[PDB]
Amino acid sequence: YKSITIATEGSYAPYNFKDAGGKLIGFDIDLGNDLCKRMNIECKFVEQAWDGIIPSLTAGRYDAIMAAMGIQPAREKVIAFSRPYLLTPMTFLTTADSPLLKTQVAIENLPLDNITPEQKAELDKFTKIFEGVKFGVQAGTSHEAFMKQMMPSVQISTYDTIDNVVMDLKAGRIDASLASVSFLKPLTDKPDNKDLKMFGPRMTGGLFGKGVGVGIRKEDADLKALFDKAIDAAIADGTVQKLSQQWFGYDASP
Numbered sequence: 001y002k003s004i005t006i007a008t009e010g011s012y013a014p015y016n017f018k019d020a021g022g023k024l025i026g027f028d029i030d031l032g033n034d035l036c037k038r039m040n041i042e043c044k045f046v047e048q049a050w051d052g053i054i055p056s057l058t059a060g061r062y063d064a065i066m067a068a069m070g071i072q073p074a075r076e077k078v079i080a081f082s083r084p085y086l087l088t089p090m091t092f093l094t095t096a097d098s099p100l101l102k103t104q105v106a107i108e109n110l111p112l113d114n115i116t117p118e119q120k121a122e123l124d125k126f127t128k129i130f131e132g133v134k135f136g137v138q139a140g141t142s143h144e145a146f147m148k149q150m151m152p153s154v155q156i157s158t159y160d161t162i163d164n165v166v167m168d169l170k171a172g173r174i175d176a177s178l179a180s181v182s183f184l185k186p187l188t189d190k191p192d193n194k195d196l197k198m199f200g201p202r203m204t205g206g207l208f209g210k211g212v213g214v215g216i217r218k219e220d221a222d223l224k225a226l227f228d229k230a231i232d233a234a235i236a237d238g239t240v241q242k243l244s245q246q247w248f249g250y251d252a253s254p
């Protein structure tokens with residue numbers, strides 16, 4: 001390799017989004033440039049809408065995906081991933097005045113790889129509470145996958161982008177959503193969003209898989225080995241922790 005094209009969404013702050021000048025910025029952009037510098041490869045970032053991100057990678061329109069992509073088992077059937085460059089649980093989002101906030105959380109940290117009757121009871125409690133509520137999710141995400149598989153009886157509306165989900169939640173058109181803590185903590189930390197609150201269990205594993213990784217074509221074993229080595233070095237020297245603090249306001253590094 002001499003040069004690679006990396007796709008990003010361009011609308012998932014603070015991982016990847018556009019600055020005032022329309023330039024792609026975020027944790028994925030800074031890390032992507034840092035990993036490529038280590039790999040001694042020229043780096044170029046392209047904007048790609050969420051729906052075609054995986055098929056455009058397999059079709060060879062670009063070489064890699066760095067777009068807050070969860071290493072989910074369903075995505076692993078189609079593409080390969082680098083080792084994780086970030087770890088984050090998943091949680092729910094509502095308004096600060098919502099009665100959903102008074103719901104008792106019996107399991108703070110909910111692993112989903114194996115589901116015990118106690119963990120199922122907790123998911124069933126939340127499903128029954130969410131049955132009388134309007135949920136909104138971004139289409140084609142692990143957020144939609146979770147609602148479809150784990151809470152099918154809950155009424156969901158799907159959106160093109162996460163920004164539209166947040167806007168409708170703020171406008172009162174939906175009552176709740178879900179995303180990773182890495183997305184929701186900087187969102188709710190903004191003085192702009194004091195009327196928004198994270199709530200419910202912090203979930204890991206199962207359909208979510210473990211961590212956020214670089215999406216690569218399965219046949220590109222050499223490119224994966226290069227990214228894995230670069231990621232190991234960026235973690236070891238404190239670069240991932242530094243970039244995580246900068247963009248997320250906390251340490252989500254593996």
Ligand SMILES: C[C@@H](N[C@@H](CCCN)C(=O)O)C(=O)O
Pocket residue numbers: 009012050067068069070071088138140141142143179180181182183212
């Ligand atoms: C970490 C990030 N993962 C989402 C990203 C959605 C970006 N459009 C996913 O893997 O589907 C999140 O849930 O916050």
